[PDB]
CSV table of C-alpha atoms and ligand atoms in Angstrom, one decimal:
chain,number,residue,atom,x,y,z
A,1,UNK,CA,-80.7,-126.6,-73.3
A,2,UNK,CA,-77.2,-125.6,-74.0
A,3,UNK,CA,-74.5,-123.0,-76.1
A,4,UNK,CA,-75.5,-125.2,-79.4
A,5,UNK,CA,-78.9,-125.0,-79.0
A,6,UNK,CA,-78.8,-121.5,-78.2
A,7,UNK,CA,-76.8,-120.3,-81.4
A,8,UNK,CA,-78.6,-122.0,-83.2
A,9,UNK,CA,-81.7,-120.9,-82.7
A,10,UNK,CA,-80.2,-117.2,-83.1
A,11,UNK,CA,-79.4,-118.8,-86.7
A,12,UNK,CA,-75.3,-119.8,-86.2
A,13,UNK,CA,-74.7,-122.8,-87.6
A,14,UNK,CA,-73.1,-123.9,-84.4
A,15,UNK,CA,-71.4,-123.4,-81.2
A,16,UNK,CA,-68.4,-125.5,-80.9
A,17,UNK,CA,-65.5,-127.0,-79.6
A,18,UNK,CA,-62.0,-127.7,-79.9
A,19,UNK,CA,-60.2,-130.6,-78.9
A,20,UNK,CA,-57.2,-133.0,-79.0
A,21,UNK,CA,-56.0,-136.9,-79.6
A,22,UNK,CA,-54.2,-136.8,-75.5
A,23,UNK,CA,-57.8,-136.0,-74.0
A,24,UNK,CA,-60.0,-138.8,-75.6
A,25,UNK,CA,-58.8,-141.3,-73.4
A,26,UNK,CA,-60.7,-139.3,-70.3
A,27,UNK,CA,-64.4,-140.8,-71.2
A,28,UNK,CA,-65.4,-137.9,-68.4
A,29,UNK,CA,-63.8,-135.0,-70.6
A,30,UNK,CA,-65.5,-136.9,-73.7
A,31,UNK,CA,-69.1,-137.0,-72.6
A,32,UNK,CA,-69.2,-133.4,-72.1
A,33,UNK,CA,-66.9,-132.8,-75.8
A,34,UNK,CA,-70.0,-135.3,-77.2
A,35,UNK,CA,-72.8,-133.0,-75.5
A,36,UNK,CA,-74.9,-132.0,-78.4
A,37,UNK,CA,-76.3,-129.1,-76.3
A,38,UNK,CA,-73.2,-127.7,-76.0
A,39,UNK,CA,-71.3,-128.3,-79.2
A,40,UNK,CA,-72.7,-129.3,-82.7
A,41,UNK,CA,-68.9,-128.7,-84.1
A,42,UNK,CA,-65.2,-130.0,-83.3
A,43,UNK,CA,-61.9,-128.8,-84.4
A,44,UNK,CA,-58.9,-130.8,-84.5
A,45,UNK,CA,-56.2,-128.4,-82.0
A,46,UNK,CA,-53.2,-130.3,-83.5
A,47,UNK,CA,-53.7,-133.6,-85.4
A,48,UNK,CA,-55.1,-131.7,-89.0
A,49,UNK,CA,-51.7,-129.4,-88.7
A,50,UNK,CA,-48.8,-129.7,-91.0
A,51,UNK,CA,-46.3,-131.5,-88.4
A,52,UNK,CA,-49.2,-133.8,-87.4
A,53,UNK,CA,-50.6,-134.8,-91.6
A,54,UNK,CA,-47.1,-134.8,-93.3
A,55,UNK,CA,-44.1,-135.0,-90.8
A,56,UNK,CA,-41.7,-136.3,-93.3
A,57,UNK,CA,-42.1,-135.2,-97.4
A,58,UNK,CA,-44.7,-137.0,-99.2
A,59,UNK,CA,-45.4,-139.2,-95.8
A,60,UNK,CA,-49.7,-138.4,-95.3
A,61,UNK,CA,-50.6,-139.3,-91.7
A,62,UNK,CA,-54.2,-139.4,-91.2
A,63,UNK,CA,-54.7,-141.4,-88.2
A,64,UNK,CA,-55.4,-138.9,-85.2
A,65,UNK,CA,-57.1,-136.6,-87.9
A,66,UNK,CA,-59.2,-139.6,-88.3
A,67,UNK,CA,-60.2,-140.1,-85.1
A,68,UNK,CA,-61.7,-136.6,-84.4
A,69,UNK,CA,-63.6,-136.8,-87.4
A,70,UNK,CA,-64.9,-140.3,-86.3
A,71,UNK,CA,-65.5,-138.5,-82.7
A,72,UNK,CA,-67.5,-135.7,-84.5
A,73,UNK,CA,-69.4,-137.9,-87.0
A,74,UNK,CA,-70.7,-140.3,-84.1
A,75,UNK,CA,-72.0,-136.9,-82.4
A,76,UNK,CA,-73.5,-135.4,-85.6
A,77,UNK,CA,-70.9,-132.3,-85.0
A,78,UNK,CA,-70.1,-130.6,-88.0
A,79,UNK,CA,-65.7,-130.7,-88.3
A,80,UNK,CA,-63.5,-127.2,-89.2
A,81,UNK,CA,-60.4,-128.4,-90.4
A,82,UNK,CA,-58.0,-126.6,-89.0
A,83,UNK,CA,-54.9,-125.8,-90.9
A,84,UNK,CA,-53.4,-126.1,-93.9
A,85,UNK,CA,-50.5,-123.5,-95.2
A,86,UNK,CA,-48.6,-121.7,-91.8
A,87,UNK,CA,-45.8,-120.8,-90.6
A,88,UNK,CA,-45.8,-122.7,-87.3
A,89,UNK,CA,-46.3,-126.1,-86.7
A,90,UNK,CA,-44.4,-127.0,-89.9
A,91,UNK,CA,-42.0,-129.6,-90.6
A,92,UNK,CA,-38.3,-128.7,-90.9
A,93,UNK,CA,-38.1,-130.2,-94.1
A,94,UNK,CA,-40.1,-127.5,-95.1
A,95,UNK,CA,-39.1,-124.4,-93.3
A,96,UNK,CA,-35.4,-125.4,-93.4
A,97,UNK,CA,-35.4,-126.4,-96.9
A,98,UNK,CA,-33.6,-125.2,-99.8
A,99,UNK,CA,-36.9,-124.2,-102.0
A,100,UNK,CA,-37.0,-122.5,-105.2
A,101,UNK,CA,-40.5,-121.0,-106.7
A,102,UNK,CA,-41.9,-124.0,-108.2
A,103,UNK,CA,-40.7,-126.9,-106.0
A,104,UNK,CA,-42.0,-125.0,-102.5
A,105,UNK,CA,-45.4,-124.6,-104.9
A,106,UNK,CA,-45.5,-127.9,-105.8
A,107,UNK,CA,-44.3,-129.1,-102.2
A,108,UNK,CA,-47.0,-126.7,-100.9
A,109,UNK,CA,-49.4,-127.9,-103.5
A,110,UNK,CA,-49.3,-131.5,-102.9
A,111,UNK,CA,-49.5,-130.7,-99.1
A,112,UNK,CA,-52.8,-129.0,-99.8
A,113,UNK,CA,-54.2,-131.6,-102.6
A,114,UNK,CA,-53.1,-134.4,-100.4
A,115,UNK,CA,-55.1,-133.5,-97.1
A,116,UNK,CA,-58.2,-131.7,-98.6
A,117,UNK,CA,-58.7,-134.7,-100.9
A,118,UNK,CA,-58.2,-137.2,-97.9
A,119,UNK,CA,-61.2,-134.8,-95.8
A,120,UNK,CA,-63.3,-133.8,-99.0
A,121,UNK,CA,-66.8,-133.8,-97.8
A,122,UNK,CA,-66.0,-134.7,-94.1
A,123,UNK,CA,-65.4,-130.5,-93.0
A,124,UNK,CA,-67.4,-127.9,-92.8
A,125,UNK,CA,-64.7,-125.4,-93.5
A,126,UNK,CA,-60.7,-125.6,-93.6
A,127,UNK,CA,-58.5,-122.7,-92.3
A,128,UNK,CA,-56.3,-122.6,-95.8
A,129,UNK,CA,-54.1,-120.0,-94.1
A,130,UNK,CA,-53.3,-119.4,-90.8
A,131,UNK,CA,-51.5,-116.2,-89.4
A,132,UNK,CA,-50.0,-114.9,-92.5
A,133,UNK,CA,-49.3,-111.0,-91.0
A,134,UNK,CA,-47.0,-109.8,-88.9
A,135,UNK,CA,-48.6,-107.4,-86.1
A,136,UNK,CA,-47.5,-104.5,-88.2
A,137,UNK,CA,-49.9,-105.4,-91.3
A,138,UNK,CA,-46.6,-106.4,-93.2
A,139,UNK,CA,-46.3,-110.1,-94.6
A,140,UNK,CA,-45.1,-111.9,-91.8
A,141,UNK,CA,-41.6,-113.6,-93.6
A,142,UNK,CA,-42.0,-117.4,-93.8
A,143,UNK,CA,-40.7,-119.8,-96.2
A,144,UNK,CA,-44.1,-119.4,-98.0
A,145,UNK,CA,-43.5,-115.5,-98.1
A,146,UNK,CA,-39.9,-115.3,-98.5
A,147,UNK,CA,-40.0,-118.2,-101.3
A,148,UNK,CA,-43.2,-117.4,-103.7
A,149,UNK,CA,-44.5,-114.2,-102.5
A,150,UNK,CA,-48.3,-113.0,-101.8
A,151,UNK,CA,-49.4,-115.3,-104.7
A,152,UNK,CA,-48.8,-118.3,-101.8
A,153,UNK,CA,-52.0,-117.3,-100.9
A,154,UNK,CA,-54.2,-117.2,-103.3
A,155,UNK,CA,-52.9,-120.0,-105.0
A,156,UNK,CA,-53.2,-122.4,-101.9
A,157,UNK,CA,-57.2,-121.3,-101.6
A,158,UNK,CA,-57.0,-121.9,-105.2
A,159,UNK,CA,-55.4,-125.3,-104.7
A,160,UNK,CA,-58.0,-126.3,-101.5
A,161,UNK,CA,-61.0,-125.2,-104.1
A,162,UNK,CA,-59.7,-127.6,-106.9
A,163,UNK,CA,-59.5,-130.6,-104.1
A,164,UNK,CA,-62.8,-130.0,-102.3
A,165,UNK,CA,-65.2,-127.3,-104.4
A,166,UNK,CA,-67.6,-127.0,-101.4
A,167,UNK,CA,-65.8,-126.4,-98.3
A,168,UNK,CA,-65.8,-123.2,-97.1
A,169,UNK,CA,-62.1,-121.9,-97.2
A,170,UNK,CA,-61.3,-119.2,-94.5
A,171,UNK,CA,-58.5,-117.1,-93.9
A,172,UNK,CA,-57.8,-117.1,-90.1
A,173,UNK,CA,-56.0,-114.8,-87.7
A,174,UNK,CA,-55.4,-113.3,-84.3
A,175,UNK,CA,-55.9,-109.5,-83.5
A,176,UNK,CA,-57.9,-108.7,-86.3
A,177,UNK,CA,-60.8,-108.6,-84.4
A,178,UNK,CA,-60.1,-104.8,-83.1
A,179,UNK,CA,-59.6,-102.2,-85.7
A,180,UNK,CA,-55.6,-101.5,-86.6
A,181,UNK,CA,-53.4,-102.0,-89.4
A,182,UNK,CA,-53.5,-105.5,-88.8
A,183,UNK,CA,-57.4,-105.9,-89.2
A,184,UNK,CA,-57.2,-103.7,-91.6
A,185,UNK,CA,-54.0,-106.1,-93.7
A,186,UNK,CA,-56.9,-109.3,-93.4
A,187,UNK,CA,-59.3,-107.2,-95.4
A,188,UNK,CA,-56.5,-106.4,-98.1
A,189,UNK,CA,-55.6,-110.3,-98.3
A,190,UNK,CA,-59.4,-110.9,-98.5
A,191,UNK,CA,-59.4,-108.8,-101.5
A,192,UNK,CA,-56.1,-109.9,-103.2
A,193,UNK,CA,-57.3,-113.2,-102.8
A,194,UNK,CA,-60.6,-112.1,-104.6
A,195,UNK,CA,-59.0,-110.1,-106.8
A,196,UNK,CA,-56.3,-113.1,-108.0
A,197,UNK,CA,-60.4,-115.2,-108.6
A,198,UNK,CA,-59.4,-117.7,-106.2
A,199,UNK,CA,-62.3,-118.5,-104.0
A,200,UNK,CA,-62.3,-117.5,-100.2
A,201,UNK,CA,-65.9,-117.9,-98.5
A,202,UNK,CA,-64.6,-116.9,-94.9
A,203,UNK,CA,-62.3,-114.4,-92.4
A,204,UNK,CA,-61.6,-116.4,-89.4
A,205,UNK,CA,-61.1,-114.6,-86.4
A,206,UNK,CA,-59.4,-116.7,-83.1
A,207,UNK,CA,-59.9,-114.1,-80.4
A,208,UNK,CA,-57.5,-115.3,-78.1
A,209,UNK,CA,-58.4,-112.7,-75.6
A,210,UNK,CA,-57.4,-111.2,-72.4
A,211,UNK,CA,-59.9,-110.8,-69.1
A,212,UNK,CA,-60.6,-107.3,-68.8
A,213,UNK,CA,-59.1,-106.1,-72.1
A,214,UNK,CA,-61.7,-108.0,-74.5
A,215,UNK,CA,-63.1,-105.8,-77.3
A,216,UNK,CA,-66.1,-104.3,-76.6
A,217,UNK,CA,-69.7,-106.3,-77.8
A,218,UNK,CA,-69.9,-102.7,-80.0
A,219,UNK,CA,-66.3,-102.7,-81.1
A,220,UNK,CA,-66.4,-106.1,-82.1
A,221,UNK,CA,-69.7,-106.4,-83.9
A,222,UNK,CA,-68.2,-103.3,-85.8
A,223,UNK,CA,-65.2,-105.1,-86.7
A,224,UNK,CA,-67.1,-108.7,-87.8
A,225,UNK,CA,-69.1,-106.3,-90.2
A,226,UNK,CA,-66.2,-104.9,-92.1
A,227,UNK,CA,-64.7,-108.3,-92.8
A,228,UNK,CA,-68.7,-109.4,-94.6
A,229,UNK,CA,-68.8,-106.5,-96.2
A,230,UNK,CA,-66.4,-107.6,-98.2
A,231,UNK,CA,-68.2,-111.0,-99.3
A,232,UNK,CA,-67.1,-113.0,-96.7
A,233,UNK,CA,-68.7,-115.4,-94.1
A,234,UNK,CA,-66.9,-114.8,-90.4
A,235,UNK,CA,-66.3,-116.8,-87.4
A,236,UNK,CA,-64.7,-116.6,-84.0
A,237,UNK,CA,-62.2,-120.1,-84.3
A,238,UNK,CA,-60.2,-120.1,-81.0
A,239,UNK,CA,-62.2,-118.0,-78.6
A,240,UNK,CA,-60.5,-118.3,-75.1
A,241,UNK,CA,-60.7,-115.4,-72.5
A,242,UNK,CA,-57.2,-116.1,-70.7
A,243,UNK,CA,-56.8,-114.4,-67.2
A,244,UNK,CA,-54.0,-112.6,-65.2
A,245,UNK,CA,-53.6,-114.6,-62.5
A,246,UNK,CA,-54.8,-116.1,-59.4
A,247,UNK,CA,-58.4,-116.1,-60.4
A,248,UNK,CA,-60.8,-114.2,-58.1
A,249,UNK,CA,-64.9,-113.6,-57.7
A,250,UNK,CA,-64.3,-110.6,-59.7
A,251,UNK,CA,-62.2,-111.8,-62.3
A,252,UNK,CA,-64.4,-114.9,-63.1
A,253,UNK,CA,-67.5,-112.3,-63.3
A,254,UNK,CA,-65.6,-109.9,-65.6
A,255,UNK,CA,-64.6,-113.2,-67.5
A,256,UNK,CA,-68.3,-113.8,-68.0
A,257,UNK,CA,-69.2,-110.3,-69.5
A,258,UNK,CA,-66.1,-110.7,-71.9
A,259,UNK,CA,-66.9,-113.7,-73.3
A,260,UNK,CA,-70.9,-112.4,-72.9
A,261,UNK,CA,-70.1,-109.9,-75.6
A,262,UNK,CA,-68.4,-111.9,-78.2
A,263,UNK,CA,-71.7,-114.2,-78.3
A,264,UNK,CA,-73.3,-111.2,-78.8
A,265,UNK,CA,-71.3,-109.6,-81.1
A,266,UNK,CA,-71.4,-113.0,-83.5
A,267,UNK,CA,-75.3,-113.0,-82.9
A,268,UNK,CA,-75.6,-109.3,-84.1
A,269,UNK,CA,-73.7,-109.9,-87.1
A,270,UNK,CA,-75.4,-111.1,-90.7
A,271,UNK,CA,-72.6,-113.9,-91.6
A,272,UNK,CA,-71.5,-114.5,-88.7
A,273,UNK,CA,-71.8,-118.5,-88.6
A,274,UNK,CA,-70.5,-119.9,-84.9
A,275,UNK,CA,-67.9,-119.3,-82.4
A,276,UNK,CA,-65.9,-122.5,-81.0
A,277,UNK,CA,-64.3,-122.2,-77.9
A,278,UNK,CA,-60.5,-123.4,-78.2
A,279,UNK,CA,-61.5,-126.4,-75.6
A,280,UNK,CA,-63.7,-126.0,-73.3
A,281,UNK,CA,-62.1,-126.4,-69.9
A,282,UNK,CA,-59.5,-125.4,-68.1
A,283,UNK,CA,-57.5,-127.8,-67.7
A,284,UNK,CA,-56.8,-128.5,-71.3
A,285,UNK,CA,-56.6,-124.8,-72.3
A,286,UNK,CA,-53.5,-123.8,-74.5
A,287,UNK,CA,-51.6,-121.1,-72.2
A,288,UNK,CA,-48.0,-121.4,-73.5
A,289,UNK,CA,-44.9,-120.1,-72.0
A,290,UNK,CA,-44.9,-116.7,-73.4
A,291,UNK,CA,-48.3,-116.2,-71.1
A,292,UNK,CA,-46.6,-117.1,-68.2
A,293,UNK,CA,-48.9,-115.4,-65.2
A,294,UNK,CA,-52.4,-116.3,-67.4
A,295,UNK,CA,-54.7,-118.7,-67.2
A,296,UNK,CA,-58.2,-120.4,-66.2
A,297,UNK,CA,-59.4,-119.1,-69.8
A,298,UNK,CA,-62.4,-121.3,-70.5
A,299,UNK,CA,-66.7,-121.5,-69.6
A,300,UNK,CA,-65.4,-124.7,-67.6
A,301,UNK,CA,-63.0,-125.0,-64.4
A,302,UNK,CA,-60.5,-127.8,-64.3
A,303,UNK,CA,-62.8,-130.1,-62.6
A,304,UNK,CA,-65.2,-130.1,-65.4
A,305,UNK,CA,-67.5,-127.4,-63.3
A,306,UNK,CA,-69.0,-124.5,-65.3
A,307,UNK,CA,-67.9,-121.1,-64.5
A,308,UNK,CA,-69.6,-117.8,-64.7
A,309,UNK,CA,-68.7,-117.2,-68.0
A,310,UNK,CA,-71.1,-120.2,-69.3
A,311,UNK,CA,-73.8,-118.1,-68.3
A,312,UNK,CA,-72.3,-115.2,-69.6
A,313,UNK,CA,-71.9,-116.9,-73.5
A,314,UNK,CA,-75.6,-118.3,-72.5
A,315,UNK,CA,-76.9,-114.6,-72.3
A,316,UNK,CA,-75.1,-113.1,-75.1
A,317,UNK,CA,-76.4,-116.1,-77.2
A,318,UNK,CA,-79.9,-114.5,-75.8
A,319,UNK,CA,-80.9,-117.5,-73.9
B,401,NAG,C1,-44.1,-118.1,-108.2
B,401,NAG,O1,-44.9,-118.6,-109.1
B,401,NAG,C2,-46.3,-118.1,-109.1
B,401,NAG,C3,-47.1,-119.0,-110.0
B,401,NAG,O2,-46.8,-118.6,-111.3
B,401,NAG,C4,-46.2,-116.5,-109.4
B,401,NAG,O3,-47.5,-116.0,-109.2
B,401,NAG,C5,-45.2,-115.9,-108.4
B,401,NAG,O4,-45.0,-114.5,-108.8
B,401,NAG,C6,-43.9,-116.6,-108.4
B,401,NAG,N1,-43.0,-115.9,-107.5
B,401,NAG,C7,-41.7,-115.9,-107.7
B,401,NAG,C8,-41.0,-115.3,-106.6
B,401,NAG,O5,-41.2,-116.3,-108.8
């Protein structure tokens, strides 16, 4: 009947969607968001981030979180909560501070604490930390890094355990769904974590891709499975397919086989628990400035009107 029904009868948990607070006023945009069919799961783009939950120190703002989890829990979606400790999307208090060891720690600490105990029970999983490499494999050098060191990490999935024991806590990342040094950097932070004993259940993998330079179904499957091998669950978080611009017949259909072979790839793979499309039509599609030239990156057009590539994610979900 639709992508959720069709993943999860091929035993994903879900297929899903992500959304924000500016859209939910267009009761058109939400029927199709509250289309059970289509997604059994939500993420929050914005209103769970850093800037959005704690904009000033100590100051918890819940509200729009709130609201998408209302959304969600009207629907019977499942919520990912989506994301605790990253460099972007942060407060200046806290990248412009003047930190030492423990007080970013605690600062960090009661930033985690705070907004896992305020969702306990309400998410499926939470991204604990987003984006922590630089394209190289090194650290990437944020406050957190800079500051604390590696530990950051495994002490804030040790800090998201301690709030909310059954989440599932992910580690999530772009380009580490083709094989490089910085696919290869997640796995090491997958072990360190494991290695410090903090709990991390899952590798989250965004797949912001491009039309025409996706990852093979092969590559990718190849890829999902050295990420559970190490005793992790996997998902793809953000999946968008942007395109070099204008959009043509051909482009739409090599759009489809793209996003055909991520399905696939997700469906092949033990672990693998659902993909969620980051939105689901084009005319709320994140394509920043740096992508200048890109676009139409979704299953739907701008009018709400599927596009081949709905077909395609149908297929590779094998229905
Ligand atoms: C910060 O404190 C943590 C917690 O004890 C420790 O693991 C880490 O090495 C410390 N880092 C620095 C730079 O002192």
């Amino acid at each position: 009947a639709g992508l959720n029904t069709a993943a999860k009868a091929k035993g994903l948990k879900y297929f899903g969607s992500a959304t924000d607070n500016p859209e939910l006023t267009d009761s058109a945009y939400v029927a199709q968001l509250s289309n059970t069919d289509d997604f059994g799961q939500i993420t929050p783009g914005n209103s769970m981030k850093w800037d959005a939950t704690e904009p000033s120190q100590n100051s918890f703002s819940f509200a729009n979180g709130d609201a998408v989890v209302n959304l969600a829990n009207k629907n019977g979606q499942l919520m990912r909560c989506h994301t605790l400790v990253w460099h972007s999307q942060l407060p200046n208090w806290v990248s412009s501070g003047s930190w030492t060891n423990a007080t970013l720690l605690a600062a960090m600490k009661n930033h985690i604490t705070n907004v896992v105990t305020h969702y306990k029970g309400k998410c499926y999983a939470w991204d604990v930390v987003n984006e922590a490499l630089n394209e190289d494999g090194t650290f990437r050098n944020s406050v957190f890094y800079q500051i604390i060191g590696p530990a950051y990490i495994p002490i804030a999935f040790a800090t998201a355990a301690a709030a909310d024991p059954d989440v599932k806590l992910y580690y999530n990342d772009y380009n580490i769904e083709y094989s490089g040094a910085k696919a290869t950097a997640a796995q090491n932070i997958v072990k360190m974590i494991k290695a410090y004993g903090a709990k991390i259940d899952g590798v989250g993998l965004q797949a912001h891709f491009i039309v025409g330079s996706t990852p093979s179904q092969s590559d990718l499957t190849t890829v999902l499975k050295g990420y559970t091998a190490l005793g992790v669950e996997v998902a793809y978080t953000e999946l968008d397919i942007k395109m070099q611009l204008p959009s043509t017949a051909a482009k739409l259909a090599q759009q489809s086989t793209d996003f055909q072979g991520v399905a696939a790839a997700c469906v092949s793979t033990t672990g693998c628990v659902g993909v969620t499309i980051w939105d689901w039509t084009d005319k709320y599609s994140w394509v920043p400035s740096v992508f200048q030239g890109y676009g139409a990156p979704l299953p739907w057009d701008e009018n709400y009107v599927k596009k081949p590539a709905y077909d395609g994610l149908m297929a590779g979900l094998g229905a």
